[PDB]
Structures are given as C-alpha cells and as structure tokens.
Design a protein around this ligand. Structure first.
Ligand SMILES: CCCCCCCCCCCCCCCCCCC(=O)O[C@H](COC(=O)CCCCCCCCCCCCCCCCC)COP(=O)(O)O[C@H]1[C@H](O)[C@@H](O)[C@@H](OP(=O)(O)O)[C@@H](O)[C@H]1O
Ligand SMILES: CCCCCCCCCCCCCCCC(=O)O
Ligand SMILES: CCCCCCCCCCCCCCCC(=O)O
Lengths: 385, 385
C-alpha cells in the first residue's frame, strides 16, 4: 500500500487524475441549468468517464476507436431493423424478438474465433447497444432521439477523459518498450553469471523474463503506433519494430542459458574434482559475456552508435582457450579401456555438455550485434563521443 | 466460420443458448402487465444476461459471486454516505463530489496491486454502482427505492441465465482439465519421436503446449472447485490438484525434449557419417519412450490402475545398451593426439550432448510414474481388467 506507492509514484498520480476527471463531470452535472429532459440520462457521462480511462495514451486511443466502431455499427443496424419492422403490422414484437435471437447468435459466434481473442471488449458494446436501442424505442416510437441524446453525453465524457489524460503527466508506451529492452539486456547477463558461478560452486527470473515477454512487447508495440511524436522520438514513423527484432535475437541466446541452468538440476552429475580442472577457462567466458551484454545494454539505453573497436575479440579468444584446454584433458571425459557401471560413464560424459553449451552461446552471440547495428542504422543514433 | 463450426460443434450450442435466454427475457419484457415504474427499467434484465453468461458453469458461479459482492458493498456505501450528507446542509453537493473524489482515488489505487490483476472486473462494478446510486438519488431523495427495484431486475436476469446455462447441455471445467492432461501426454510423445527422427535425418507444438499451459491448468482447477458432483466424478471434494501435480511432473520431462529440439538448430553440428554409427541405439530409446508415454496417457484416460508388470524395463535396457555403444566407440568424440582448429573439435563433441540429453530424459521418466501412482491412489481408479 504505502510501500508500493512509495516505490512507484506513477500509480499515485493516475488515481488522482481519475478522481479529478470524475469531480469535473460531477460538478458539471450538479451545477447545470434546470433542463427537465436530460436529468433522466445525464448519468451517462460519468459512466463513460469510468469506462474509457486507461493507463496509456495509445491504449486509450485504440480502444476508444474500437468501442466507437462497435457502438456506431450497432446503432445503425438497430435503426435499420426498427424501420423495417413496421411492414409486419400484425407481428412487430415477434419480428423484433426474432431479430434479437439472430443477432445474438451471430455476435456470440463471431467472437469465439481464436484470432479475435484480444477484441472481446468491442463485441460486448455491439450487443449491448443493439439490445438497448431496440428495446427502449419500441414504445411510442422515438428511435432516432434515443441515440443522438445519449451519444452526445458519451462524446462529452470521452473528451473530458482524453483531455485530462493527455495534458497532465502522461505515460507513454514507447518509453515503456524502450525501458523493457534494457531491463531484459541486464537480466540475461545476471542470469549467465549466476549460472556459471552456481555450476562452479564447491539465475531464473532473468532468462524467464527474457523468454516470456514477447506478448507484452507486442501489445506495447501495438499501443505505441497511435502516439504522436514527442521527446527524443521525433519522427512520423518511428521504427518500433526493430526493438522487437532485437528482443527476439536476444531471446534466441537466452534459450542456451536456460539449457545451462537445466544442466545443474540434472539427476546425473559429474564429480567435483573433475570440474575443478576447468575453473578459470569456464569463468573467463562468463565474465566476458556479461561485460559484452551490459555494454550493449548501456549503449542501447543512451541511443548511441557502436565504436570502431571490435566487441567480440575477447570472448572469442576465451572460447578458443577453452577449446584448447578441453582438447588437452579430453581423457577425463571418456574411458579408453573399453575402446574397440553406467552411472559413472554418464557422470563423466555430463561435463562435455556444459562446455559445449557454453561454446554454443558464445557462437550465438553475433546475431544480437548484427540486429543492434541494423536498429542503430534505422533510427538516427548519436555519434559516440 | 462454417469450417470452424463443423470442426467444433460445441460452439454452435452456446450461441443458441445465449440467443434463447435473450429471447425469453425479451418476451417477458414485451408481454408484461402494465406498470408505472417497472416498465421504464425492464431493460436492466436483458443486459445482465449479456454480462454474466460464461462458457463454463464454475466461471459463471465464481464471477457472479464476485460481482454480487462488489455491487452490494457499493450500494451499502452509497446509502450510508447519502444518509451522512444531510448534516452538512449548507454544502451538500460539495460533500457528495468530495466523497466521489475520495472513493474514485481509493478504488483506483486498490486495483493496481500486482496480486489483484485477475479481479479487475469486480473493481469496475463497485465504482459504477457507487457513482450511479449517488448521482441518481440527489434529486428528490429516493435513495433506497432506486436500489431494490434494479437489484430485483438483476436477480431475475441472472436467474434466467443460470437456469439456461445449467439445464441445457452444460460444459464442465473438470472434464476440460481431464482432457487437457491426456492431450499433453500425447503431444510430448509426438514431439520426442519427431525430434529423434529429425536429428537422424539424412516437434514444436507438442512441448510448447506442454510447457505453456500451466496457467490454463490452474484457472480450470479454480473453476472446477465450484461445480457440484456429476458423472464419473462422484465425490464432495474431488482431488483436482493431483492432476496439476502430474502435469508438472510431465513438464519437467518436456524441458529436456525442448533442449533436444534446440540441439538441431545449433550453429555447430557434427558430420552425418559419424552420426550414422549410433542410429539403431538412438532410435530404440525414442520408440520405447513414445510407447511408454502413450500407455500412460491411455491409462489416465480410462481411469484405470497400473498392472503388476514393470513399465520401465525396456527403456532402461535400451539406455544401458546405448551407454555401452557410446563407451565402445568413444574415440570418435575426442582426439587423443593431443593428450597430456577448434570448429571440428566442437562439431565432434556436439554428439555427446545429444546422447547425454537422451539419457537424462530416460532418467527423468520415473517421477512421472510416481506421480501417476499417487494420483491413481488418491482417486479410486478401477482395477485393471
Ligand atoms: C437508420 C440508421 C442508419 C445509420 C445512420 C447512423 C445512425 C447510428 C447512430 C449511432 C448512435 C448510437 C448510440 C446509442 C447509445 C446507446 C448506448 C447503450 C450502451 O452502450 O449500452 C450500455 C450503456 O450503459 C449505460 O448506462 C451508459 C454507459 C456508457 C457506455 C459507454 C461505452 C463506450 C461508448 C463507445 C466508445 C466511446 C468513445 C468513442 C470515442 C469518442 C471520443 C470523443 C453500455 O454499458 P457499458 O459499456 O458501460 O458496460 C459496462 C457493464 O454494464 C458493466 O456491468 C461492466 O461489467 P464487467 O465486465 O463485469 O465489469 C462492464 O462490462 C462495462 O463495460
Ligand atoms: C447498465 C445497467 C444494467 C447493468 C447490467 C450489468 C450489471 C452487472 C452486475 C452483475 C451483478 C450480478 C449480481 C448477481 C445477483 C444474484 O443473483 O445474486
Ligand atoms: C450502472 C448500474 C450498476 C448497477 C447498480 C444497481 C443497484 C444494485 C445494487 C443495489 C444494492 C443495494 C443494497 C444495499 C443494502 C445494504 O446492504 O444495506
């Protein structure tokens, strides 16, 4: 509560902004000219305020657009059907209930398509609007004024919500994707160091977050294309997709770290005295990889180009040293007596797996640098000092 | 559309059930005994059906409970504050709009906790009810008479929805958990066979679904605790948690299959002619593993206990034969000339990784059998024919 608000003060301004918009609309309702008609449906502007206030600008715009589409299409259909029903003078309510059944069937079937799972909020407003408009206009006609009057209040509430959200300490979604990339870049290096240290002893959140955030970064990329230029991101079509390409290149590397972590939890393990022979070569690779990943993260954070010096020299040298060391002592991994128990042989063979997975990670490192170079070319990154 | 319906005929009955409930409510609203007030709020009963109709019984029962909690607490608070406001006679609107501000702030702050992410639908009902009751009773008193009528309409709509859902071809969430476990059991075996065949060539959906459905198996289990006894599951407290334990035991095995699939996409790979030496031993393990997993899935499906014979004899024998074969021809994995380039050495060493991962999978198989035995003990499974 108090602790969570203290740690993140972004969540205490949003609640106050929502309260401020609600207070504004409440005052505008309470202090108004005594017009008898609207006081029976003036409660709609505050429900619109409650329903259309979202955390980010891009989400607000995109979901308001979808809700408006649904409302307007449902209203058009309801008006058309109500106009048509008059022909069947003897059976008007029968026709209305038969239209309600069919529309409810169709609207419920079309929302169960798996590819429309993220738009379930826009299929509810369609059915609500159709049913409300059809049932509320049956008596005494009055179909076309039970729509304009209740749509103008919705417009007013949406305008108030948009103004308050957009003109007072706004939160953007592109700066959230920009920060998420940097966080993943640091988590992966922490995980790698932890795994190597744990194996060499006499880790999970990092690669888990680096391998389980594809949908978060895609929702964030779908919210960031609605927002206008601001701050450092001065351009009409900012390439938000190259960030996702870099994230995928990094996740491909994180898979190997996940396999290395799985190596520790294995039922079959190698003796300690055999592990201790390769300590320094195994540790140097992890040190160099962590340094490279942190350097790439810092360069991404400040929007800077790569320098002239090669970044993969040291880790490649360490990997070649590791290969030479493995070649020199390969007689500890296999047994030559049987050349032409089983648990001991499996334990002896289980160390080559760890070494080969480390070498595979080092080999995979280069796609990330290629993707970073492409992204820094697409967006105008500053020349390094 | 039509293809989706023909593939899955369960989605054509849900859509007709919703339509039928809507039609019933519409008929009751269109053929009602003339009433002065009730006729102006009849529409409140046809939107409840839209809002509370869910795919499964338990979800409908868990979410209606929470929605009722939110609505009742909001109504109580609104009535209390309306009674309280009378003391400040000079400034009534100011007090009302200040309590609106405070309630909006607190309700927005309490829903941003990370542990209340799945209950966002109940924090909206609270604010909507509070604001509606406060704003609708300001003129002409009438605070305790605008609640009972609309809550009777809400109750009627919810009752119609519940009756239609529970008395016409219901869908249960425990038969969905029970089906999901069997599906994972078959997907994993298909993935394993595909991976082995692909590596020996001269796989993704299986382990992907077996490793990414933990939340589905927890949501279905939280829905299935509300449902009364029915069909084969005759008991007051059915052990739905042993299914989750078995699923986790299977996921621990699926991790190594994912690693084996990853070994195929590596940058460093071994020559084909050297792989071909171990073909039969590599294929026998996959065949036996697939057969065992399919046997376990079939026995889970029919709710039957394991027989007296040991199910892990053949796979253990195949693993031992593979280990002997590797021990006999170990000189193709290392190079002894250097005993005291790197690309070819890494390629040669990359095959021991595959063999060791296969042996680790065989080693991990036994916890799944332990979990199955425990589950078949906890629930009364039929003795084998
Ligand atoms: C012949 C014709 C030819 C064509 C010509 C053109 C003619 C077309 C004319 C078009 C005019 C049509 C306008 C018709 C007005 C009728 C609207 C009725 C309606 O919209 O229906 C009810 C109504 O309710 C009420 O009281 C009012 C509540 C307000 C609704 C606002 C919804 C959003 C509107 C669209 C988007 C706006 C923004 C657009 C951008 C604009 C920028 C300026 C909906 O309710 P709701 O959305 O608030 O839903 C609740 C639910 O009620 C809870 O219970 C919760 O439940 P839970 O999920 O459990 O938390 C949640 O679900 C929660 O969403
Ligand atoms: C806009 C006015 C109509 C609103 C209709 C949707 C209201 C959603 C609230 C659901 C409350 C469900 C309470 C269950 C009642 C019960 O049977 O005990
Ligand atoms: C937008 C409309 C939301 C639905 C709110 C309709 C009112 C239903 C809830 C009123 C229940 C009030 C009961 C309070 C009795 C008490 O606990 O003292």
């Amino acid at each position: 509560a108090w602790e969570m608000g203290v740690s993140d003060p972004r969540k205490i301004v949003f609640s106050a902004k929502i309260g401020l918009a609600l207070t504004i609309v409440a005052l505008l309702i309470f202090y108004q000219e005594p017009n008898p008609d609207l006081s029976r449906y003036s409660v709609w502007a505050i429900l619109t305020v409650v329903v259309v206030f979202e955390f980010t600008i891009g989400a607000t715009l995109s979901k308001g657009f979808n809700r408006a589409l649904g409302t307007l299409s449902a209203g058009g259909l309801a008006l058309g059907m109500a106009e048509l029903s008059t022909l069947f003078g003897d059976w008007e309510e029968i026709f209305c209930t038969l239209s309600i059944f069919c529309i409810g069937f169709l609207a419920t079937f079309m929302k169960l398509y798996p590819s429309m799972k993220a738009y379930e909020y826009g299929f509810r407003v369609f059915l609500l609007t159709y049913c409300y408009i059809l049932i509320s206009g049956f008596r005494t006609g009055q179909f076309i004024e039970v729509a304009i009057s209740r749509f103008l209040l919705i417009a007013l509430g949406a305008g108030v919500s948009l103004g308050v959200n957009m003109f007072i300490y706004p939160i953007w979604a592109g700066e959230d994707l920009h920060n998420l990339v940097v966080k993943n870049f640091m988590n992966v290096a922490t995980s790698l160091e932890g795994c190597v240290n744990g194996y060499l002893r006499c880790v999970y959140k990092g690669y888990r977050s680096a391998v389980e955030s594809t949908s978060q970064e895609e929702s964030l990329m779908s919210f960031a294309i609605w927002e206008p230029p601001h701050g450092p991101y001065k351009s009409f079509n900012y390439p938000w997709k190259n960030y996702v390409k870099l994230s995928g290149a990094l996740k491909h590397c994180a898979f190997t770290v996940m396999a290395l972590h799985g190596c520790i939890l294995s039922e079959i393990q190698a003796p300690e005295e055999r592990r201790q022979v390769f300590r320094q070569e195994l540790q140097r690779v992890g040190v160099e990889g962590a340094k490279l990943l942190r350097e790439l993260g810092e360069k991404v954070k400040k929007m800077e180009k790569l320098g002239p010096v090669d970044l993969l020299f040291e880790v490649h040298l360490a990997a070649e040293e590791l290969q030479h060391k493995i070649d020199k002592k390969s007689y500890l991994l296999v047994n030559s007596e049987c050349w032409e128990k089983t648990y001991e042989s499996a334990s002896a063979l289980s160390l080559a797996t760890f070494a080969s997975l480390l070498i595979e990670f080092v080999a995979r490192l280069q796609n990330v640098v290629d993707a970073f170079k492409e992204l820094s070319q697409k967006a105008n990154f500053k020349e390094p000092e």
